[PDB]
Design a binder for these strands. Structure first.
Ligand SMILES: *[C@@H]1O[C@H](CO)[C@@H](O[C@@H]2O[C@H](CO)[C@@H](O[C@@H]3O[C@H](CO[C@@H]4O[C@H](CO)[C@@H](O)[C@H](O)[C@@H]4O)[C@@H](O)[C@H](O)[C@@H]3O)[C@H](O)[C@H]2NC(C)=O)[C@H](O)[C@H]1NC(C)=O
Ligand SMILES: *[C@@H]1O[C@H](CO)[C@@H](O[C@@H]2O[C@H](CO)[C@@H](O[C@@H]3O[C@H](CO[C@@H]4O[C@H](CO)[C@@H](O)[C@H](O)[C@@H]4O)[C@@H](O)[C@H](O)[C@@H]3O)[C@H](O)[C@H]2NC(C)=O)[C@H](O)[C@H]1NC(C)=O
Ligand SMILES: *[C@@H]1O[C@H](CO)[C@@H](O[C@@H]2O[C@H](CO)[C@@H](O)[C@H](O)[C@H]2NC(C)=O)[C@H](O)[C@H]1NC(C)=O
Ligand SMILES: *[C@@H]1O[C@H](CO)[C@@H](O[C@@H]2O[C@H](CO)[C@@H](O)[C@H](O)[C@H]2NC(C)=O)[C@H](O)[C@H]1NC(C)=O
Ligand SMILES: *[C@@H]1O[C@H](CO)[C@@H](O[C@@H]2O[C@H](CO)[C@@H](O)[C@H](O)[C@H]2NC(C)=O)[C@H](O)[C@H]1NC(C)=O
Ligand SMILES: *[C@@H]1O[C@H](CO)[C@@H](O[C@@H]2O[C@H](CO)[C@@H](O)[C@H](O)[C@H]2NC(C)=O)[C@H](O)[C@H]1NC(C)=O
Ligand SMILES: *[C@@H]1O[C@H](CO)[C@@H](O[C@@H]2O[C@H](CO)[C@@H](O)[C@H](O)[C@H]2NC(C)=O)[C@H](O)[C@H]1NC(C)=O
Ligand SMILES: *[C@@H]1O[C@H](CO)[C@@H](O[C@@H]2O[C@H](CO)[C@@H](O)[C@H](O)[C@H]2NC(C)=O)[C@H](O)[C@H]1NC(C)=O
Ligand SMILES: *[C@@H]1O[C@H](CO)[C@@H](O[C@@H]2O[C@H](CO)[C@@H](O)[C@H](O)[C@H]2NC(C)=O)[C@H](O)[C@H]1NC(C)=O
Ligand SMILES: *[C@@H]1O[C@H](CO)[C@@H](O[C@@H]2O[C@H](CO)[C@@H](O)[C@H](O)[C@H]2NC(C)=O)[C@H](O)[C@H]1NC(C)=O
Ligand SMILES: *[C@@H]1O[C@H](CO)[C@@H](O)[C@H](O)[C@H]1NC(C)=O
Ligand SMILES: *[C@@H]1O[C@H](CO)[C@@H](O)[C@H](O)[C@H]1NC(C)=O
Ligand SMILES: *[C@@H]1O[C@H](CO)[C@@H](O)[C@H](O)[C@H]1NC(C)=O
Ligand SMILES: *[C@@H]1O[C@H](CO)[C@@H](O)[C@H](O)[C@H]1NC(C)=O
Ligand SMILES: *[C@@H]1O[C@H](CO)[C@@H](O)[C@H](O)[C@H]1NC(C)=O
Ligand SMILES: *[C@@H]1O[C@H](CO)[C@@H](O)[C@H](O)[C@H]1NC(C)=O
Ligand SMILES: *[C@@H]1O[C@H](CO)[C@@H](O)[C@H](O)[C@H]1NC(C)=O
Ligand SMILES: *[C@@H]1O[C@H](CO)[C@@H](O)[C@H](O)[C@H]1NC(C)=O
Ligand SMILES: *[C@@H]1O[C@H](CO)[C@@H](O)[C@H](O)[C@H]1NC(C)=O
Ligand SMILES: *[C@@H]1O[C@H](CO)[C@@H](O)[C@H](O)[C@H]1NC(C)=O
Lengths: 659, 659
RNA sequence: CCCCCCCCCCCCCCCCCCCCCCCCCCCCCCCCCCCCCCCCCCCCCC
């Protein structure tokens, strides 16, 4: 029963409440216990409780005396119990409750008036019960109740009389999910004082019943209406007629298996702002299908279209000018679809668009012709996502229409070509370009000469070729900050590749082959490709096969903080190498061949750190080579994980395995 | 000028012969020098010479006084000189010479009688000279001359008169290669006393001139006749008519670009025993093409047939019963051909065949149907070679016709299947089966149950699968001696896999993954799969990833001599492991992680060796761990290559790199 | 001045083989999570 300010007793197998706790405890948690009964006589000591979570237990019934001992209780949680009987005196003395959870209590019928005696209630939960009617009392009560949950019940109708108790209550959420509701009575929602949101997820309504619901929702204050998994196979221009008289803003139609969308179906939602259509089975989107939605600010179409079938090749076709109506659209999530391709008028009319996602949106967008993004000429796009589209070639002037583009995501594709440099023309405001996980890229002298504003360039596992050109391909990128060149099997790097990139901060070169470039036997001398990077912060050089470190590689990294050198073949290091790393924070040298840690090399590096990773190193336990290191280990504040588990000497055999 | 019994002065840039050598020297070699002249006055000291190789020098002329100082000279070599003038007195005093080389001396014309004064000459060489006629004198001499070489000369005719000097000489070899001979005179070869072999390689004869040659060779004692690269495009039944009256045994027709072979072409060679046809362009072999060769004991057909061409797909077709005439054939080398496949009557009639080679003989022999080798039912084959035939499947009873087969070579193929065990039925006398470098093989319990007589089984780089069956697939192979299982990436081995193989001698398991089977943390205990191999001699366990050696793995290898354990991860070894290796000869532990060599483990192993390979090991220079080893290195007779080059300690840094 | 034969030496090209390092893929084994399922035991409600 650990407790400092709140009390936790979760999964402690308690049968009776403890009697030894501070009197001024505010939260008392007893989830996942076996409390058969809860006598109130044991709550005399606990008279300052605010939250009482006694859920997931086996309480049969409660007593009104429990509330007497708690004068200021605000939360009462009784999830997954056997409290199937309620009375007027059950919640009589409790009047400050702002939360009441009764989920999965097997409550069958609300008898007379269990909730009359409280007026400050905010949230009421009745999910997973055996209730058949939404009647919670006779007179009007629950003045401040804002959220009412009735999901997973056995309610088959919504009669007008049963909601007469909410004539003056502002319901912000009426959860009625998973209830086989098949009849709606007139005035059922008009009787509710102020209904702001309705949720009918997993409710088998159907199109005709959906139209009846919308008609019953006319001239009300609804703002949200979730109809997920409602088996809404087909919509028409009259399905949402009843919403013409309201101001609905959020509509959810996900998982409805919507086979087709009718012409002018959504013309009755001029105030819609958030529209959801993910995980549907739409086979054809008409030009006027999305008519009347000129105020939508966020449209989701993830898996909204039909998948390809070898039987018929029923690829979902999107007609031209289909998105011309979404004037105020600002976010289009359109991932995991099977569209044949982009047309010249597919995205016409989106004059306020700022985010377009096309991750795996097309079956085969092999070539990015310069006319592909012509429909996005007037769209002020900022972020474009094109991952997993199996793109194989990008022609010149492909992105010449996206003048406002800032983030381009071309990773996880099959782009194999030579970057002539003309592919990035027109990206005058580009900031980040992602190209990782491609087939193979061949850089040129002027590959990135047309995008001087670039700041991020990720090229992880792309099999870079001709990166060792005499003019550095990264020279025009004066504002570059993050560069990733990992898992490219790079062999040769020139010393002037990173020349002029003063603002570079994060550089990744792990999982490459640069061992030869740093050995003293390399013809032409070791390559010092890390000079001038005065603002470098994070350096990664894992699995490079390094066997020797030149003395003056880190001579100018005055602001280096994180350096990674694990999975290398380092055995000895030059003396006085980390002198300029005055602000180093994390040093990683795991899975190396280092046998000696001396002050002459690791002195300045161990000045003020916060992490250290030298786990799988064959240390040599000798006072000449490890004594300073173990003495430093003894007194320090640096975090060294697995210090006593893997920091084991290998030689001499006398100290073989001794930490 | 190193010399103990013979004198060598090759490539020493001598200008004059040395005057300080033992008097009783028998061989005096001066090849590749710059001896402008060779005065005989310097040979007074050297009067016991038998061989005098002064070739590849710049001697202009010699003097008869040179022979006077040498009474017993037998070899006179003058290759690549400028001795273009010969006289009767040049070789007068020299009479014991049994060898005389005059290659590339730019000799223009033999004037009168340069070789009369000797009668014991055996071999005479005159290659790469400017001679235009084969006249070497006027009268008859050279009684004992057996070999005469005249290759690469400028002889354009073979007149009868020019060979009148060999009326009583037995010529075993008359080399006339690379001479543009275009006319043969009657009686040219009949004038020669006893001609046994003629060589006309690289001589542009042609079919009509070949027939004229054969007619001129009638009723003579020739036995060999090499006509390689003679531009013999076509043969007919009359090309070799002139050989009907002789007893020719060896005939060479290689590189002749023989496009077609005529019907009954070789019916005139009943005594032929060695026939060569390699590197030809035969497009079709007729049934009666090889008629009359019922005495051939060795036929070579390597690249004898035309290669495939995409223009016409002119695959060389071999008619049925084409080899029916070779009754006494015993060796058929038939590699590197483009035959479409094997037929039911391709090899019929070979009742004495004992060696058939079909390495890369067919373009695509994908499936080995049980009817493929039906033509070899009565052939007493012993060795069959089927490498690089791109064989993809072997059906049951494929080798049911080869009852006398002993060696089967199926390696370097693409055989991917499951060895049900019925493929080896009928191999009652099989000894060796080669299957290395295949696609993938899946062994079964009774894979080799039908060939208990097997002794060799090579399975290198075949990706063995299901080798860890509960019954050992090698159990029926009671007489197995050599087993190769390298580069198969084998993971799991049962301890009874090699049970009962007492006669096993050589076992290869390198380049596999058996590290887990020997660690003490392996569930079920370490696998001791080397028990009962009392006759094991060679063991290979390279690149297995071993990290720990069980103590009693080599407890029964009483006759082990060569053990390989290089490229492993061994760091420590159990004490008293090599006790039973009383006859160990070579121990290989290179490229390991061993840091300590102690008498407790390497004592018995270093008893009496002949080789040791521990080059790339990070030894720990400490008197507790290396002192015994270095003391043993000091005094020993074992061969330790690169002892002072790679046996360098890694730790402590004081001894870093010191041998 | 031309045509050739040798000695020595330095580059260049092709192929074979070996070694170091690395990448990708795959196999074997282990571990950490997530979901689902089955069984045993205890405690309650109807
Ligand atoms: C363009 O769209 C694509 C696709 O939507 C975006 O890719 C997404 O990028 C984010 C950020 O990198 C990814 O989130 C990551 O999720 C991984 C999940 O790994 C988990 O690891 C735990 C470990 O226990 C496992 O148990 C889990 O099962 C799981 O494997 C997480 O490790 C990362 O830290 C990170 O949060 C996201 O997954 C990825 N989407 C897809 C489909 O791959 C891309 O960012 C976007 N471009 C832009 C510019 O926004
Ligand atoms: C069925 O026929 C096949 C094909 O004729 C036979 O395969 C032959 O097998 C022999 C013996 O294994 C091979 O000889 C080997 O040749 C290699 C050559 O390697 C060399 O290495 C030097 C190293 O400096 C290089 O310079 C050279 O260039 C060359 O690469 C040699 O290393 C071995 O020691 C061995 O002598 C032969 O090459 C091989 N033939 C072919 C075409 O691969 C096969 O034996 C035969 N089956 C039976 C049962 O006879
Ligand atoms: C939906 O929104 C419209 C526009 O905001 C509301 O119409 C206004 O309502 C307010 C409050 O009753 C009136 O003061 C305005 O005069 C109305 N303007 C117009 C042009 O009608 C409408 O009431 C909202 N719907 C509901 C059900 O409240
Ligand atoms: C109607 O739905 C919208 C969209 O789900 C809700 O807006 C989000 O609400 C969640 C829950 O409070 C927040 O976490 C998000 O930040 C909201 N998004 C935005 C863009 O504001 C909205 O609250 C719902 N309205 C009602 C009355 O339930
Ligand atoms: C919704 O509007 C679109 C746009 O007009 C309709 O598409 C037309 O369908 C007819 C009938 O096949 C075609 O002849 C026209 O060529 C289509 N128009 C265009 C621009 O291609 C669509 O039919 C309408 N929906 C319904 C249900 O009628
Ligand atoms: C690289 O970044 C710098 C700094 O963000 C950019 O310089 C700014 O340019 C704008 C517009 O010309 C000026 O208003 C700012 O005053 C500049 N900042 C400074 C500190 O001088 C520069 O334009 C960027 N380079 C590119 C090619 O976009
Ligand atoms: C080729 O071989 C045959 C058979 O060996 C030779 O014929 C024999 O020659 C010897 C020697 O002259 C005689 O004694 C035999 O009587 C011959 N027998 C027959 C059946 O003819 C023949 O001479 C050989 N060819 C040459 C050119 O010598
Ligand atoms: C005729 O040719 C055959 C085949 O080349 C010769 O027999 C081989 O001769 C070489 C050279 O002496 C030997 O190394 C081989 O061992 C011989 N092979 C066999 C099977 O004996 C034969 O010597 C040649 N005959 C003449 C007279 O030159
Ligand atoms: C050499 O003998 C073979 C075997 O008879 C001849 O092959 C025959 O060729 C004729 C003409 O095309 C065909 O009609 C026969 O069917 C072939 N025989 C067989 C058994 O297939 C071959 O023609 C002869 N060589 C020459 C030059 O005539
Ligand atoms: C395995 O090898 C042994 C020895 O070579 C074979 O035993 C010989 O068999 C022959 C024929 O039956 C006998 O004449 C020998 O006396 C046997 N030798 C010994 C030492 O007993 C045995 O047959 C071979 N196994 C197979 C299946 O062929
Ligand atoms: C509750 O309902 C009564 C009767 O309609 C009404 O007078 C009162 O204003 C309502 N409560 C609130 C807080 O509006
Ligand atoms: C559906 O469209 C038709 C065609 O204009 C129209 O007559 C009808 O009124 C629409 N449905 C509703 C419910 O308005
Ligand atoms: C680039 O776009 C223009 C305008 O559509 C077009 O005329 C031209 O052919 C395109 N270039 C290429 C290489 O396709
Ligand atoms: C060194 O690290 C400690 C611990 O995080 C921190 O308190 C101190 O300020 C650091 N010193 C400097 C100069 O940053
Ligand atoms: C350092 O050593 C002292 C003396 O043994 C010990 O008291 C102290 O706990 C050690 N510090 C750490 C972090 O272990
Ligand atoms: C040399 O030729 C003569 C004349 O024909 C002959 O008598 C003599 O026997 C021959 N020499 C030998 C060794 O046969
Ligand atoms: C070639 O064959 C024909 C047909 O039998 C025959 O008449 C002729 O004699 C043969 N040639 C020779 C040189 O015998
Ligand atoms: C095996 O050979 C016999 C005889 O030619 C044939 O009848 C049978 O079909 C062959 N078996 C298979 C599986 O082809
Ligand atoms: C040990 O090796 C030496 C050297 O080869 C050899 O002379 C000697 O006979 C060997 N001893 C035995 C018992 O084989
Ligand atoms: C062994 O050491 C002795 C003493 O230094 C030396 O004379 C002898 O040459 C050494 N043996 C070898 C094989 O180097």
């Amino acid at each position: 029963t650990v407790s400092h300010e709140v009390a936790d007793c979760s999964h402690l197998k308690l049968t009776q409440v403890p009697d030894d706790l501070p009197t001024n405890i505010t939260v008392l948690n007893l989830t996942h216990n076996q409390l058969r009964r809860l006598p109130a006589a044991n709550f005399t000591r606990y008279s300052q409780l605010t939250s009482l979570d006694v859920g997931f237990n086996t309480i049969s019934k409660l007593e009104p005396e429990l509330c007497q001992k708690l004068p200021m209780l605000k939360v009462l949680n009784l999830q997954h119990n056997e409290l199937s009987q309620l009375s007027d005196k059950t919640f009589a003395f409790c009047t400050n409750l702002t939360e009441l959870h009764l989920m999965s209590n097997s409550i069958q019928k609300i008898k007379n008036n269990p909730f009359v005696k409280q007026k400050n209630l905010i949230t009421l939960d009745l999910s997973h019960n055996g209730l058949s009617s939404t009647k919670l009392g006779t007179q009007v009560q629950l003045e401040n109740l804002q959220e009412l949950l009735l999901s997973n019940n056995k309610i088959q109708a919504l009669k007008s009389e049963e909601l007469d108790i909410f004539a003056n209550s502002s319901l912000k959420k009426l959860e009625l999910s998973s209830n086989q509701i098949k009849e709606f009575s007139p005035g059922c929602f008009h009787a509710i004082g102020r209904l702001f949101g309705l949720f009918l997820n997993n409710v088998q309504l159907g199109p005709s019943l959906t139209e009846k619901l919308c008609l019953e929702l006319a001239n009300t204050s609804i703002r949200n209406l979730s109809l997920s998994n409602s088996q809404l196979s087909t919509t028409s221009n009259t399905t949402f007629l009843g919403l013409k008289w309201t101001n609905l803003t959020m509509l959810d139609l996900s998982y409805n298996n919507l086979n087709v969308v009718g012409n002018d179906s959504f013309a009755w939602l001029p105030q819609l702002e958030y529209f959801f259509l993910e995980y549907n089975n739409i086979q054809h989107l008409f030009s006027h299908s999305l008519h009347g939605l000129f105020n939508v600010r966020y449209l989701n179409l993830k898996r909204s279209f039909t998948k390809q079938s070898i039987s018929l090749a029923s690829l979902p076709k999107i007609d031209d000018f289909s998105f011309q109506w979404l004037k105020c659209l600002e976010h289009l999530n359109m991932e995991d679809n099977d569209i044949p391709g982009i047309k010249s008028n597919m995205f016409t009319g989106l004059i306020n668009l700022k985010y377009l996602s096309l991750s795996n949106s097309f079956t085969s967008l092999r070539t990015l012709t310069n006319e592909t993004f012509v429909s996005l000429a007037h769209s002020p796009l900022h972020i474009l996502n094109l991952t997993k589209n199996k793109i194989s070639k990008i022609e010149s002037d492909a992105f010449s229409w996206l003048g406002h583009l800032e983030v381009l995501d071309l990773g996880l594709n099959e782009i194999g070509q030579e970057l002539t440099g003309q592919e990035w023309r027109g990206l005058e405001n580009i900031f980040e370009i992602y190209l990782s996980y491609n087939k193979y890229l061949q850089l040129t002298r002027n590959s990135f000469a047309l995008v001087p504003s670039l700041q991020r360039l990720m090229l992880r596992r792309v099999a870079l070729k001709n990166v060792d050109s005499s003019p550095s391909p990264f020279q025009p990128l004066r504002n570059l900050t993050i560069l990733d060149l990992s898992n490219n099997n790079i062999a040769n790097i020139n010393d002037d590749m990173l020349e002029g990139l003063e603002k570079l901060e994060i550089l990744d070169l792990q999982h490459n082959n640069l061992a030869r470039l740093w050995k003293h036997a390399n013809p032409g001398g070791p390559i010092y490709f890390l000079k001038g990077l005065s603002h470098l912060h994070i350096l990664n050089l894992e699995s490079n096969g390094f066997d020797e470190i030149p003395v003056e590689v880190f001579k100018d990294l005055f602001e280096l903080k994180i350096i990674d050198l694990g999975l290398n073949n380092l055995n000895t290091l030059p003396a006085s190498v980390f002198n300029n790393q005055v602000s180093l924070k994390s040093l990683n040298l795991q899975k190396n061949l280092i046998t000696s840690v001396e002050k002459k090399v690791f002195g300045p590096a161990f000045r003020n750190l916060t992490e250290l990773d030298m786990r799988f190193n064959p240390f040599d336990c000798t006072c000449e080579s490890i004594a300073w290191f173990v003495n430093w280990i003894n007194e320090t504040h640096t975090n060294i994980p697995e210090l006593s588990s893997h920091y084991l000497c290998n030689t001499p055999p006398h100290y073989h395995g001794f930490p």
